[PDB]
From Swiss-Prot, chain A:
It is found in: Cell inner membrane. The chain holds residues 24 to 215 of 267 of the full protein. One of its GO terms (cellular component) is plasma membrane. It is a peripheral membrane protein. Disruption phenotype: Essential, it cannot be completely disrupted. Cells with very low levels of protein have no ordered thylakoids, are barely green and are non-photosynthetic. Residues 3-133 form a coiled coil. Belongs to the PspA/Vipp/IM30 family. Signal peptide: none annotated. This is Membrane-associated protein Vipp1. The lineage of its organism: Bacteria, Bacillati, Cyanobacteriota, Cyanophyceae, Synechococcales. The gene is vipp1. Keywords: Cell inner membrane, Cell membrane, Coiled coil, Membrane. The keyword Lyase does not apply. Required for thylakoid formation. It comes from Synechocystis sp. (strain ATCC 27184 / PCC 6803 / Kazusa).
UniProtKB/Swiss-Prot annotation, chain B:
This is Membrane-associated protein Vipp1. Belongs to the PspA/Vipp/IM30 family. Disruption phenotype: Essential, it cannot be completely disrupted. Cells with very low levels of protein have no ordered thylakoids, are barely green and are non-photosynthetic. The chain holds residues 168 to 215 of 267 of the full protein. It comes from the Bacteria. Required for thylakoid formation. It is found in: Cell inner membrane.
Length: 192, 48
């Protein structure tokens, strides 16, 4: 799943930045050393130059020239170290700028994926809500109402059977009942 | 992110299936609902 891969890459980025910090710190250490080394070296030539000044006092031109020999050796080393120090300074800034750029990549890459994942998860959640609203199943009760409706028709069918058989000669006796009813109405007129 | 993106398309495909089936005669009943809505607006004019 992209979620795990994106998360893992984010986790990996955590390791990378630490290493570059160490590399920079290593670079800081190296430049400091050559700075320390070259600084003292420049002075040693002065010290031996002083040894020549003692020779300049009396006689030992050999010592003076010897002192120059150390002087020549030291200055060459300082130039070489000065050249070396330039490389570290350039390299140090390269890593520094590379680290700065790398940090931007990690931050934006991490956050953008997370929000994308969050909204994507939100998107499906909203879609599910709409689907479920359409997926409401209470309409299935129509079968139950249909079931009862059939029973009603059965009662109507029973009513058809009940009503059709109702016809009998008794209907004639009702006319007698109504005929007798008129008698009380006739007697009611007598009371009136 | 590509993996999730495919899922989004699946939801859109589901939306296509959901939306296409949505059409029903019920739409006519909405006109009745809106027609009844005008009655209260007409009654609202009566109150005015």
């Amino acid at each position: 799943d992209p979620e795990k891969v994106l998360e893992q890459a984010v986790i990996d980025m955590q390791e990378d930045l630490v290493q570059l910090r160490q590399a920079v710190a290593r670079t800081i250490a190296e430049e400091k050393r050559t700075e320390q080394r070259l600084n003292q070296d420049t002075q040693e030539a002065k010290k031996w130059e002083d040894r020549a000044k003692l020779a300049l006092t009396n006689g030992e031109e050999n010592l003076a020239r010897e002192a120059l020999a150390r002087k020549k050796s030291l200055t060459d080393t300082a130039a070489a170290y000065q050249t070396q120090l330039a490389q570290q300074r350039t390299m140090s800034e390269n890593l520094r700028r590379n680290l700065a750029a790398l940090e931007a990549k990690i931050s934006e890459a991490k956050t953008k994926k997370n929000m994308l994942q969050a909204r994507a998860k939100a998107a499906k959640a909203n879609a599910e809500l709409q689907q479920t609203l359409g997926g409401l199943g209470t309409s299935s009760a129509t079968s139950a109402f249909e079931r009862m409706e059939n029973k009603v028709l059965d009662m109507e069918a029973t009513s058809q059977a009940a009503g059709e058989l109702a016809g009998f000669g008794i209907e004639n006796q009702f006319a007698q009942l109504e005929a007798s009813s008129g008698v009380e109405d006739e007697l009611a007129a007598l009371k009136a």
